Structure formats: C-alpha cells, structure tokens
Design a protein around this ligand. Structure first.
Ligand SMILES: *[C@@H]1O[C@H](CO)[C@@H](O[C@@H]2O[C@H](CO)[C@@H](O[C@H]3O[C@H](CO)[C@@H](O)[C@H](O[C@H]4O[C@H](CO)[C@@H](O)[C@H](O)[C@@H]4O)[C@@H]3O)[C@H](O)[C@H]2NC(C)=O)[C@H](O)[C@H]1NC(C)=O
Ligand SMILES: *[C@@H]1O[C@H](CO)[C@@H](O[C@@H]2O[C@H](CO)[C@@H](O[C@H]3O[C@H](CO)[C@@H](O)[C@H](O[C@H]4O[C@H](CO)[C@@H](O)[C@H](O)[C@@H]4O)[C@@H]3O)[C@H](O)[C@H]2NC(C)=O)[C@H](O)[C@H]1NC(C)=O
Ligand code: NAG
Ligand code: NAG
Ligand code: NAG
Ligand code: NAG
Lengths: 46, 48, 46
C-alpha cells in the first residue's frame, strides 16, 4: 500500500490484473493480536 | 518512419539508448505524469 | 495525513483555515479497540 495509490474500481481500467497488495500495517497488528491473545490465555490460568 | 515507429512502440527510450518496448497506454500514462496529471486520469478516461 | 505533510503551527500561515484531517490509522485501531473490548466483556461472562 506504500508503493501504490488507489483510485476507482476494477471495471474502468482496460487491462487491469488481479494480484494481492501487501498492507504492511496488517501483520504489525496481527502480531499485536497474537500478543493480545497470549496475554488473555495466561490471564485465564491463575 | 523510424522516428515515428520508435515513438509509438518505445516512447522516449529509443532516444536515450536501446528502444525498450512499452504499451502505448502505459507510455501515455508516463506522459501524463510528465505534465503533473496522475496516471489514473488516463486509464479512467482512456476511451475518451 | 497521507495527502498532507506538516510544518509549524496555526499562527504564522496567512490565510489558514480550520478543517479536520482524517487519520486512516485511527479507525484501523478503533475497531481493534472494539474487538478488544468485546474480548474483555466476554471474558467477564464465565
Ligand atoms: C479478479 O477477481 C474478481 C473477483 O474475484 C473476478 O470477478 C469474479 O469473476 C467470477 C467469474 O466470472 C464471478 O463468479 C460468478 O459470476 C456470476 C455472477 O457475476 C455467477 O453467475 C457465477 O456462477 C455461475 O457460474 C459458475 C461457473 O463460473 C457456476 O459454477 C455457478 O453454478 C453459476 O452457474 C459465478 O459464481 C464473480 O462474481 C466475480 N466477482 C466480482 C467481484 O466481480 C475477476 O474475474 C478476476 N479477474 C481475473 C482476470 O482473474
Ligand atoms: C480555528 O480554531 C481555533 C481553535 O479551535 C480557533 O482559536 C480559538 O478561538 C476562540 C474564539 O476566538 C478562542 O476562545 C477563547 O478566546 C479567549 C482566549 O484566547 C478567551 O478569553 C475567550 O473567552 C471569552 O470570550 C468568549 C467569547 O469569545 C466569551 O463567551 C467568554 O465568556 C469569555 O469572555 C474564548 O474562550 C480560543 O482561545 C482560540 N484557541 C486557540 C488555540 O487559539 C480559531 O478562532 C478558529 N478559526 C477559524 C477561522 O475558525
Ligand atoms: C492484448 O491483446 C490480446 C490480443 O492480441 C488480447 O486477447 C488481450 O486481452 C490483450 N490484453 C490487454 C491487457 O489488453
Ligand atoms: C503469565 O503470568 C505469570 C503470573 O502468573 C507471569 O509471571 C508471567 O510472566 C506471564 N507470562 C506471560 C507470557 O504473560
Ligand atoms: C481576502 O480578502 C477579504 C476582503 O476582500 C478579506 O476580508 C480577507 O481577510 C482576505 N483574506 C486573506 C487570506 O488575505
Ligand atoms: C465468548 O466466549 C464463549 C465461551 O463462553 C465462546 O464460545 C465464544 O466464541 C466467545 N466469543 C467471542 C466473540 O469471544
């Protein structure tokens, strides 16, 4: 999402192709989710 | 013919060096960037 | 915050106006907070 910018939708651009666009913020929150998960896991134990 | 043929098939690359092919809509998109209009303004209006 | 850069404050620029500036990271963390909140709420239940 840093290399690219977004405009419109797929119907208008002649020759557009399908490929994933990496959102680097996603895993930076995913490991945050897993950090949150393990905090909850441990908090159940005592 | 050579100058015109290189322009449509290779843009300005054939002047700077070896003629590198590039789709003309892709080439025109680089030209729009050259004039300070974002390239999506070409693709979203290519027919026009 | 992605369309704009920042420099200084509101006293120096002649003709400056008042308008909100959207931060796309805020809601991306806000729904993360709501996801977090429901996790805590459900953890009170058992
Ligand atoms: C880039 O990704 C886009 C989204 O993933 C793709 O668009 C999708 O294209 C598919 C296939 O054309 C389309 O599938 C449905 O299309 C009909 C509704 O529009 C629907 O009737 C179809 O169901 C029928 O056909 C299938 C077999 O094709 C049968 O098995 C069914 O039983 C039924 O008879 C089918 O479900 C998607 O709707 C469409 N999604 C969107 C959001 O447009 C692009 O094609 C893709 N482009 C490239 C170049 O890969
Ligand atoms: C863009 O937003 C800025 C911040 O939101 C605005 O600056 C604010 O402007 C307001 C109003 O001019 C100002 O309010 C206080 O101003 C005095 C302190 O500087 C204070 O004495 C005032 O209180 C007195 O006056 C009011 C009526 O004005 C009375 O009702 C009170 O009872 C009292 O007598 C008032 O509370 C802010 O201080 C000021 N903030 C900052 C950070 O400068 C801009 O005006 C705004 N510009 C535009 C074009 O919209
Ligand atoms: C390129 O041209 C071929 C026909 O030669 C066509 O089938 C294909 O869809 C075209 N692709 C694009 C991106 O224009
Ligand atoms: C798990 O909880 C214990 C307290 O019972 C604490 O000492 C430990 O550091 C915690 N570990 C993690 C990974 O949260
Ligand atoms: C623009 O002009 C108007 C009057 O013509 C004046 O009230 C206003 O303050 C001016 N704005 C700026 C930024 O100079
Ligand atoms: C809430 O906890 C129950 C267990 O009591 C579980 O089955 C359910 O999936 C949980 N839901 C959420 C949203 O955490």
């Amino acid at each position: 999402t840093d290399n690219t910018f977004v405009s419109g939708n797929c119907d208008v651009v002649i020759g557009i192709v399908n490929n994933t666009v990496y959102d680097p913020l996603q895993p930076e929150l995913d490991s945050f989710k897993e950090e949150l998960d393990k905090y909850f896991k441990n908090h159940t134990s005592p | 013919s050579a100058l015109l043929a290189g322009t449509i098939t290779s843009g300005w690359t054939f002047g700077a060096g070896a003629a590198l092919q590039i789709p003309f809509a892709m080439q025109m998109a680089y030209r729009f960037n050259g004039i300070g209009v974002t390239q999506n303004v070409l693709y979203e209006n290519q027919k026009l």
